[PDB]
Amino acid sequence: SQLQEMMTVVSQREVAYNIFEMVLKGTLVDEMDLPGQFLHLAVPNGAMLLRRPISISSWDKRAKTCTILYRIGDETTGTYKLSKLESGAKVDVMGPLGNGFPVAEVTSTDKILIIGGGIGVPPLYELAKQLEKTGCQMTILLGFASENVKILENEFSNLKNVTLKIATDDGSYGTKGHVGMLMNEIDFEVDALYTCGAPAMLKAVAKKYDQLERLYISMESRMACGIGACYACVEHDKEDESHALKVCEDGPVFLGKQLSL
């Protein structure tokens, strides 16, 4: 009903090197409202029981569709088998799941910074779309390993009150290097930050903006149940000694530093 559904594949195309964009259609889209939430998809292989957690990149309310961008591995992975799906194929889906990004609690006069990289970039698209509907400044800094991997540029720059900066480690397109270089250039006073990407990048962001109150980090972890019952996807709270946080239920997104709920 509202938790699981056999969604239909509207389309599936490869948009970057080994990165696919799948558009799903189904009633589950109705429960979506927060950015950063994820879908737990089932692989079309009876020998692969663990569902793959992939964030929602965006959704169309009127068209009743949702779009996810994901990277595939070799012949033996599930994402690979997922990418073989044609138009009309059914996908067993569990979602929306997780705590999304806190959006409707910011003014129309704030300076927003959104930092992304690699496959962490997709959920950040729906974030900007939701913040554009509110008003103020948005400066998105996106980093990639190579241009061959670069995704969502056309639709990110197609947003109003948005300033987009792309960076690339080796396979250069924008500013040569890592997102850390872009962070160094920004002058304005940031009031909120939203990040999602590689653990190394998240470490740089949390370190540079150590005492920024509204610092939101979307985390990744190896999951199983996806609802908070198995205790697989666990992380430490405000220091080792405290509570244990589940990235599937308490997260994906948490508060600042090396994790606070």
Binding site: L49, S221, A229
Partner: protein, 305 residues
């Protein structure tokens, strides 16, 4: 439910034999959002230890062919919190749902402390002694050692004591007999086998703990072998588990010699797997000439030698 599915086990008056396995259902909070937990015969909650435990470093899970590996490390909020929050929550919302409490520890004294207390909870109808945690076990591989423990816990428990066996042994028969002679009211089996997975890029084991427990349909044949082996010479009931994913499996466990059935890993694949099994069970029984599970148990029991 209906009469054809009900089974009577020590301390457990189940409406149907479907029980979610320990560590796969938390304390019921998460899955309650999905469906009415009252549809279940009982629940085997996560291991409780004397002191709260964080567990092992991550990653804690990995996927294998028709199964998965886990090395959670017995994470639980401790006895105190479980006695005051977890169990009471279940008793407040689902007063008629009998629960089986899973007990673990690093030494006899730890097991003893938990067994002596956990029975006070009104809704806890039986204890499942976890002497088999893989990654528990140092107690499940020696008959005399297991027996010593079981005897001590039995002397302090206010509810029936079920003992969870490990499949990681050369001969499970001596262990089963010893545990029975020591006072166990029943047995549950099996816990997980041990396995490892390596990441080709890092050349390191995927799990931080290196080794983990293997569960899922992959281990069903091993579970059946052991249950069948043990059922041939034990006079106490066995609640079977290991790779059950559908109603057919449930029935297969019965043919092997189990009285009730627990479902673990399947919940991860399909959160409604339990209610589905319960619904499909009567149709399947019709097809295989089974009037009631109570009659099936006796039939399998007398068709021995």
């Amino acid at each position: 439910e209906n009469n054809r599915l009900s089974v009577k086990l020590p301390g457990l008056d189940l409406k149907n034999p479907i029980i979610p396995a320990s560590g796969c259902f938390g304390f019921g909070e998460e899955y309650a959002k999905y469906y009415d937990l009252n549809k279940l015969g009982s629940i085997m909650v996560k291991a409780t230890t004397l002191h709260p435990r964080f567990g092992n470093p991550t990653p804690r899970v990995a996927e294998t062919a028709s199964g998965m590996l886990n090395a959670i490390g017995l994470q639980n909020p401790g006895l105190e919190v479980i006695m005051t929050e977890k169990l009471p929550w279940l008793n407040e919302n689902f007063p008629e749902l009998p629960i089986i409490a899973n007990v673990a520890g690093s030494e006899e004294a730890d097991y003893v402390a938990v067994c002596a207390k956990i029975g006070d909870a009104a809704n806890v109808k039986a204890i499942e002694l976890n002497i088999s945690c893989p990654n528990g076990q140092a107690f499940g591989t020696d008959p005399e050692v297991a027996a010593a423990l079981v005897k001590a816990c039995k002397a302090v428990s206010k509810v029936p004591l079920y003992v969870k066996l490990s499949p990681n042994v050369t001969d499970i028969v001596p262990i089963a007999k010893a545990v029975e002679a020591a006072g166990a009211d029943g047995l549950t089996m099996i816990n997980t086998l041990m396995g490892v997975r390596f990441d080709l890029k890092t050349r390191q084991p995927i799990l931080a703990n290196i080794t983990g427990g293997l569960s899922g349909p992959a281990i069903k044949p091993v579970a059946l072998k052991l249950i069948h082996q043990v059922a041939q010479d034990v006079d106490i009931p066995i609640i079977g588990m290991g790779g059950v994913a559908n109603a057919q499996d449930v029935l297969e466990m019965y043919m092997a010699g189990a009285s009730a059935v627990a479902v673990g890993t399947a919940n991860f694949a399909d959160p409604f797997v339990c209610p589905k099994i319960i619904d499909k069970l009567p149709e399947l029984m019709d097809q295989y000439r089974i009037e009631s599970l109570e009659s099936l148990i006796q039939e399998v029991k007398e068709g021995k030698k």
